[PDB]
Every structure is written in C-alpha cells, then in structure tokens.
C-alpha cells in the first residue's frame, strides 16, 4: 500500500479527506504440460536394444 | 425457545408481553385466529414455539 499526508497548523483534520485503503493483487497462472514420450516393441527390447539408460 | 404468534393476534398488546419477566402480571391477553369472514378458528394460545 501507499499513502499521503496532510499539513495543518494545529492538527484539526475534521473537514478534510482521509486516506482510503485500495487493495490490489498480482495473479499468476499455470501453463501447459511438458511431455516427452517414447515407445518400442517387445522383440526389439530383447534382440536390438542395449544401454537403455 | 421463542413463541410464534400472528400479527393480527398480538397487535396492540406488545407492551404487556415485552415486560412479563420484570413486572408480575396476573395474566396475559391475546386474541383468537379468524377467517376472512370473521368466524373464529383457533383459540388464544400461541401457534407454537421454536425448537
């Protein structure tokens, strides 16, 4: 929040305006999923795939 | 618990009901229930009480 002051010779602030409390927010949102997908046949795993890690 | 009454039943008598625990009345007055034609349907008892 932010405010403002007043200047009076004696402190009488009866007839002037007072600071109001206007509140604001910052809104964040989620994005889109990040997906990496692979596939391979069962025979390939047994005969033609090594060092999968 | 609070009693439930009708406006036409209790109107004009609220000053006696508002102070039944401070003063010590001999009785409490209340009217009857009437139809649109003026016939009497129910007694002077309150309709019910809240739970």
């Amino acid at each position: 929040h932010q405010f403002s002051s007043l200047r009076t010779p004696t402190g009488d602030i009866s007839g002037q305006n007072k600071n109001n409390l206007i509140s604001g927010k910052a809104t964040g949102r989620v994005g889109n999923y990040i997906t990496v997908a692979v596939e391979y046949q069962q025979l390939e795993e047994a005969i033609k795939l090594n060092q999968l890690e | 618990q609070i009693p439930i009454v009708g406006m036409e039943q209790i109107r004009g008598l609220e000053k006696h009901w508002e102070a039944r625990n401070k003063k010590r009345p001999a009785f409490l007055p209340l009217r009857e229930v009437r139809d649109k034609s003026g016939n009497i349907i129910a007694g002077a008892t309150p309709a019910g009480y809240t739970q």
Binding site: T10, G11, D12, I13, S14 | -
Partner: protein, 52 residues
C-alpha cells in the same frame, strides 16, 4: 471508559473527568457536583434585625 478521579474540599467531594476530542485534537476537563436541600420546619429560623 473515561479517565476520572475525585477531590475533596471542606468536606465536599467533587468528581473530575478528563477527556479529549480526537479530530479537533483538543483536551478538555470537567468538574461536577450535585446538591440537595431540605427544609424541615419553617418555624425554626428566620432573619433578625436590630430594633430602634
């Protein structure tokens, strides 16, 4: 909820209140008393003056 005290003078008690107005930013004080008189019998008093 007002700051108060009492004071004494010649056997009489006086109540003092101290308060303030915030917006005008002023401070004020008051002292209060309440008397009461009775007259029992008028035939037991009066005014006297010297005879000529």
């Amino acid at each position: 909820s007002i700051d108060s005290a009492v004071a004494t003078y010649e056997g009489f008690s006086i109540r003092v209140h101290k308060y303030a107005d915030g917006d005008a930013n002023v401070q004020k004080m008051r002292f209060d008393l309440l008397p009461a008189y009775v007259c029992f019998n008028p035939h037991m008093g009066g005014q006297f003056f010297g005879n000529p």
